[PDB]
Copies of this chain bind each other. A is one copy, B any other.
Amino acid sequence: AFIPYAGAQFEPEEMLSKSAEYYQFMDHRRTVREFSNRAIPLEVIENIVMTASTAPSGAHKQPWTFVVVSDPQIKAKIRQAAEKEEFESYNGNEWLEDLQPFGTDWHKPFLEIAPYLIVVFRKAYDVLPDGTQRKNYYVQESVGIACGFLLAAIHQAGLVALTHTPSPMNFLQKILQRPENERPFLLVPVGYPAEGAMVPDLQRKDKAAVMVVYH
């Protein structure tokens, strides 16, 4: 069965102004690594997560699981395991030169200070109630896109985030007790920014370095 499309449509002038304003708005977004521990209603995070879940996906499999962690003990254990992996990584060269402008150590207090950690898992396949497996398609792409929606929703809500690698992969899977068809994809602490929060003075690429037009 099919149904008519019910999306809002605008005339060219509204479209120009809307697209210009959204660009300016999203250009203000920056990765923030120093959080306030100020509380946020679960309902806001739920809205944000289900917004991420409206993303398109290969064959409409929605091959993702969002684990929302506010439990300070689990956050503590996650931070501990994460800080341990990085300690080994930060001493054992191309990489280290690329990382210089961000001023990051193996320290990760944001993993406990942020009121919520959103841990994104990808699903390689679904397990029917039969025990049988049914594979999903273009999972990497689908979950990446959903993560894009997640971050867009976080910004829309006036919050900040830090997109973080899912290390330690094994530990995240264990402590959050996710099944075999799932693997950690991203780790995203969410919260208000610290009052005096600073970010690296970075510049994004210009149109010419990012965009190629075939008229």
Complex contact A59–B176 (CB within 8 A): no
Minimum CB–CB distance for A42 against chain B, Å? 7
Q: Mark A53-82, 1 if CB is under 8 A from B, else 0.
A: 111100111101111111100100000000
Q: Most chain-B CB neighbours within 10 Å: which of A4, A19, A152, A157?
A: A19
Q: Are B18 and A211 in contact (CB under 8 A)?
A: no
Instruction: Please determine whether B16 and A134 come into contact, CB atoms closer than 8 angstroms.
Output: no
| A interface size (C-beta, 8 A) | 108
Give the interface SS of chain A, mostly helix, strand, loop or mixed. Answer: mixed
Complex CA gap A74/B102 in Å reads 41
Q: Are A9 and B193 in contact (CB under 8 A)?
A: yes
Q: How many angstroms from the CA of A153 to the CA of B18 in the assembled complex?
A: 9
A66 with B29: CB separation less than 8 A: no
Chain A residues numbered 174-215 whose CB sits less than 8 Å from any CB in chain B: 176, 185-186, 192-193, 196-202, 204-205, 207, 210-215
Q: Complex formed: what's the CA distance from A82 to B151 in Å?
A: 32
A148 is an interface residue with CB less than 8 A from chain B: yes
0 or 1 for each of A19-54: is its CB under 8 Å from B? (1 = yes) = 110110011111110000000111110111111011
Q: Is the CB of B140 within 8 A of A10?
A: no
Asked whether A84 is an interface residue with its Cβ less than 8 Å from the other chain, the reply is no
Cβ of A174 to closest chain B Cβ, rounded Å: 14
- Check if A158 is an interface residue, CB within 8 A of chain B: yes
- Least distance between A197 CB and chain B CB atoms (Å): 4
Pick from B51, B66, B98: contact of A59, CB below 8 A.
Answer: B98
Which 3 A-B pairs rank lowest in CB-CB distance, beginning with the nearest?
A: A148-B148, A144-B144, A19-B47
Q: Which A residues contact B (CB, under 8 angstroms)?
A: 1-10, 12, 14-16, 18-20, 22-23, 26-32, 40-44, 46-51, 53-56, 59-62, 64-71, 74, 94-95, 98-99, 101-103, 134-135, 137-138, 140-153, 155-160, 163, 165, 176, 185-186, 192-193, 196-202, 204-205, 207, 210-215
